[model samples]
Target chain A: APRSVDWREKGYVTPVKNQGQCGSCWAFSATGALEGQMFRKTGRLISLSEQNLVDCSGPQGNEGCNGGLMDYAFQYVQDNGGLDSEESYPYEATEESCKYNPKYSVANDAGFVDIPKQEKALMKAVATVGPISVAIDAGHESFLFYKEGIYFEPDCSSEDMDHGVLVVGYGFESTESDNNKYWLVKNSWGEEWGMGGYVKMAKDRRNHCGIASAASYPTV
Target chain B: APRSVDWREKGYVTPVKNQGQCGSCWAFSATGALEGQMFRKTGRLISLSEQNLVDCSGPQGNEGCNGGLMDYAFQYVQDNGGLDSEESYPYEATEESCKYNPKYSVANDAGFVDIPKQEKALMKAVATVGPISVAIDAGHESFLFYKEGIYFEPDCSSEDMDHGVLVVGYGFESTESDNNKYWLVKNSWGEEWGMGGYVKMAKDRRNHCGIASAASYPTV
Candidate 1:
């Protein structure tokens, strides 16, 4: 992998979205990773439906809106044939019944690969493969109002990874003391939050907040 | 009943909303009727949650998003203690697991009463009680694009009531040929549809399209 890479600059990332009061950040992260893979495979940048996964992935052991696992979501997409577009299966930010119609499918996933639980492995995946889905400890208030700068919460739990996000790139910020390595993480808290719905999370710090604990990416 | 009565003019009706591609029009219709009753009881025209009923009322014989009956939905509201505000439990236009919290409930229904399957009875209920929930045959293309004027689908079936709506009022339109009696109906297809999300159906034409066949209203 190179020193840094950003899929957003390469036109492989979709616009930021809000999950409202629903616990659907996992669906957004999964769709973000799948969207990146779809772009790489088909050369078409399309916004896949998070609502499709949120509603239809319940039987796949993925809870709708109440939170879910990205790997299970990938399996659901593969089993359900494909995923609908954001236009056809618009997100409502709330749990609803599965209305999956293969006719409106815009993308499909063969499966997903889980990255080794290491910062270097996650960095390599995001740098080479595309945007990678990962879970992190985002329960702190500082993480909630995170604006700019390298975000690092010492009190944030690595085992209790409650929030899912997409790591689109990684780079180092040169400061007076030393260089600050950070992960370019995309959030689902709308554009008004953080740095336009993104956060530069502290990287190479013993995998703080479990950023690399549950990293994975879809295969299209 | 008076010659005319419109709950919309009396601040008893909520704004028009779209159900998207989901078949949750029944929830919208049920909420419309409950909102009218809530307005009469508390003088507050709060938008109740159609999603609440859609997700929570499945055991009550109302299929979430697929379709349901207003009476069953009213029962679900009563059984579940009350219904949440639309802001708290907003509509998702699909089926999902119920995430109801009694603390966020904004309105409660004691029960519901069904009106006789007659035009005069439906008019009396709408004028005195509030906006009455009724189902109609909206499976025709003419009903889909009903822009303005008195809409009367001659081939519309009275038995096949596939769409739910609110009968807010009744009035007679003065035409050059003669007088046309119509029922002002509120639809859930958004404001861009017929007459700002409303339609004028033939009122006394033998209960055309089953407008009176399943008319009912909730009690707060």
Candidate 2:
């Protein structure tokens, strides 16, 4: 199903972002996926403004620092021309009025697509269409302490997806008989968290923790 | 002949050092191999000084800032008892007069060995010994933009080996149709260069590009 690819190998994924404690994972996920798509299409690693989406996407149904959705952010970008550079509208980690300026727009997005609620579909999308922004129930305290290995929370909920993350790559680490597939996900937390601001989400299961519940990526 | 081994995954290789614009890769290679050996022996990843050798290792046939040999540096270490920490005799790129302080010398290496001129010998050494210091003709311009892949330089040479490096690991990556063997080499050109100050040297091909021309490590 797309030969298991790590988009990082192709120089597609950007540097990991820190969302602080603002609950702005949606903006990071949206910007990450959009940045990846733009890089693939434009041959430039553009760092788009997550703050733009956080502040400007309110009319499109985004809740700014409180929490948001990839679809609403994408819709905001589509209607508002594009997102600004991170330099122009730097992240503040707190809700503020829309200060996004069109002159500072670096990457424009047409829209986004929610992949089917299936692991295979997500795999194909990641391999072919660049990174995808997905939501998961990252509510478990154990999820915050992830250091290595494919994280499997038997107690984690699969029905309610509450956190957004950037699925940059997917692959499996194999021991002779057992192969553990995982999504190389970028988080909003700093490098001290997880595997240098990234997490390996368990894959090849029943979309564990509702990772495939709301997966979407931008079309550059 | 022996199974593949990686000193890096075993937590042997030290953090990548930067040589700046100077031709002091030899010092870096020597320090890296020595650090790995020390770590494996004593479980301490001590940051040894490359500048100590750069400034002092002259009598054993070294040119300091211009260029030097790893064997000569190791010989200098053997004669001088040990080397100082990076914090004690820090790197400055420029050829400063030898001002090494014996009080700062922390780690002592017994001696070094030139591995047999064969890929199998190198593998056995990596599996049994620690990291190895080797010289190669890094004169190829294509070697600069080496991002990631099984780097194969058909025209690379063993005759005029100029650059030095530390081979910390070995493994063969296998796809369904191809198997690519490589040496995980540590470099001193800084983290932004090559795959995070490391290059994958082609392995099992009778020492491609003089990687086996002059290979050696340290004894802690």
Candidate 3:
């Protein structure tokens, strides 16, 4: 893996979005991965539709709004031929009937692959494969009120994942002895939270919060 | 002055706040300067009340929700003895009758000082002092949709300043030739705009947008 990389600085990431009170973080994560891949292929950073995934990806074991998985959302996008732009299938932050229009489809994912549950593997994927969709234990109050700095939750669980986020980059702050390594995670809670809707989580703390436990990426 | 400095990293700056539809940016800028000074003196990063300045500084030439000046707000606070906390005098985004209470006052500014109309002087103040309040011509649409990167408004007028802001730090991104220097400015437009309610303005561009023309700081 490269020493550091921020896809946001490279213009591969979209603006921070708000998910409101709905548990639609999975849809946002999957759309971010797809949007990154589409930008890498076409060199055009377009905001993809999370609402399309929220409404249509349910048949693929992905629930609308309540919860879902990035891999299943990827599977739905691939099987459904393509995904629309946010302008066409705008988000309502709630469950609605499918409004997938073939004419508005702007990007398509061929498939998706899961990375091994290891920090190094996650780092490699994020460094080379663009933004990756990952799940983490974000139910803690520390994670909720996080503003800036390298976030570390000692009690965070590896199996109790409650939030889906996109890992766009990774880096470490150099110090005397300990290099404070962190993963730059993009969240869908809007720009009012964290570092402009982003968080720097402890990267080498044995996959803190299971950041690498369910990491996956889309193939364009 | 030091090569670079960010008061936010040192915990001297408060969280990014929203001014809503009100033109109380001058009040926010004034409070930010006071908060920074308070933190340096007492080691407490207390959120001072902008609503206090907005409501009570009218006699000192501040127009509350319509518009105002940072120096006038500072003068008002000095004459009023102290300013209250945000928790007690919560922001209402509108002009309300003054509810001055010295009991809830958490910080008091002795006075304020204006910086020289030069980039070097502004740099010295921001690096040595605390967050400096400055005015800028932020009426352009480019400033309205600014997301990331070093902001440079070539057509920005220095004489037509319309918005008040706080300069918290200054730095330069290393490059082959041009060391892209920038001022880390804090705005009252909430965290959704710019870099988490902050912007990196071109620092060495002849005091771009008159950023150094009307710079001032509070004294603890």
Candidate 4:
């Protein structure tokens, strides 16, 4: 059962995907949060291609592989047709290229748009009825994981943003009438992972990974 | 410490890198395995670019949001002056254009190529490397998850493969090393979700979720 996490005004938001196995977690996390924001603007949950971002998002030295931020990835993916499907591009921990997908997929570049982060402003963004992008820590342990359920579990609570994941929704696990103490969080680790391919995290986590407040999206 | 996995015997095996967020996994697992196999062949560990695999490899399916095997991904990058550094292609788990990386950071195409398998050999493959892809049978609890040093910790062993994970290695957790057991698998769900982002599964269960034995990779 997911929980209700409506809080004071609002703050920064975080929604990213965990990159298991590959060294591309940083890149995925950076872009994933932005994708959510972009979706909100498009009113369509078109899965963005992470390969496109990995192939053309960062610069050399530290910014490229050592680690990356969601904001930069967002900017990169928005330019292309969003991104290729995971099946089409597949993931490799290291950086490489943007091959042509056999699936005729399209990660439509929504453009280098700025997402409103003010909680009140985000409230307005949400009011407009769209998606928002946010960021969180999804460390290495998250890289070689299995099973499904609420991430941010008790095992590794202190570690913040070590790894990155995505937050797709904040609905109750049970139902609207019932009080559920959880929220539905989607990850990039594929469907074989977590709750039907998502992580049902606790909404009580202050800032909810700082998602509700900082949620940003592409301009429609 | 990373274990010494023999990939030459395993040949070019297929790895399931579920690119839920992007097709980057295809390149990562494929290149990783190829690199590992190259090490097995020449006893040299080289780092390849998952990004190069993504951009240069065409005819790939799902674009950058779907899934793929490691075998083909390797072939693509090798043909294109190897993969670039994570810098040339900052990962975002989405599709992007190729930068045709110059520094060619790391060993892009190096001496990693055209490795051989042990003539229809499977055991040798396992003996020489880490993790093997196979189907899972999640119809039972005893066969569901891994916890407290146990494998298959999550009760959701019957889940589908929307993600590409690495089968780290195979072994028996029991004090008796010779105990008949399953594969010690690694997942991408995140430690916050499961046993530190890993699970143990039956080696022969054959879950049959479109999961056949994919290839394993190593650091060449």
- Badly placed stretches (over 4 Å) of model 2 are A175-179, B2-220
RMSD of each: 23.3, 20.1, 12.1, 21.6
Model 3, B1-220: lDDT tens digits are: 8888998898899999999999999999999998999999999988989989888998999998889999998898889998999999999998899997999999887789999999999998998888999999898887988775467666788778989999999897632123268999999999999878889887887778889989998888
Task: Give TM-scores of the second chain, every candidate.
Answer: 0.97, 0.94, 0.97, 0.60
Which is superior by DockQ, 1 or 4? 4
Fnat of candidates, each listed: 0.00, 0.00, 0.00, 0.00
A46, model 2: CA deviation in Å?
A: 1.6
lDDT of 3 at A196: 92
Candidate 2's displacement at residue B21, Å, is 62
| CA lDDT of each prediction against the hidden true structure | 0.87, 0.83, 0.89, 0.46
Give the alpha carbon lDDT tens digit for every residue of A1-220 in model 4: 2123321113223223445556555455445544444454454444455665667665422254455555566566554445566556765656675574535554444544444533344444433433345445444364246354334333333324544444444544421112234444556666666555566554544544444443444433
On lDDT, the candidate that comes out on top is 3
The model with the greatest DockQ is: 3
Worst 10 residues of 2 chain B by lDDT: B171-180
Query: Which of the two, 1 or 3, has more TM-score?
Result: 3
lDDT of 2 by residue, A1-220 (tens): 3324678878788888888879899999999998888898889987888888888999999998889999899999999988899989999898899998889999888988989998888888887788899999999988978998787788777789999999988765532222246888999898888999888888866788888779999877
**Candidate 3: Cα lDDT at A168:** 94
CA deviation > 4 Å runs, candidate 3: B1-220
- Tens digits of per-residue lDDT for model 1 on A42-128? 899999899999989988899887789999999999888899999999999888888988899999888889999999889888888
Model 3 chain B weakest 10-residue run by lDDT: B172-181
Global lDDT of model 1: 0.87
Candidate 1 regions off by >4 Å? A1-220, B176-179
For A1-220, candidate 3 gives per-residue lDDT tens digits of: 7878899998899999998888999999999999999999999999999999999998999888789999999999899999999999999999999989999999998899999999999988888889999999999998888766577776889888989999999987533134567899999999999889999888777888999999999889
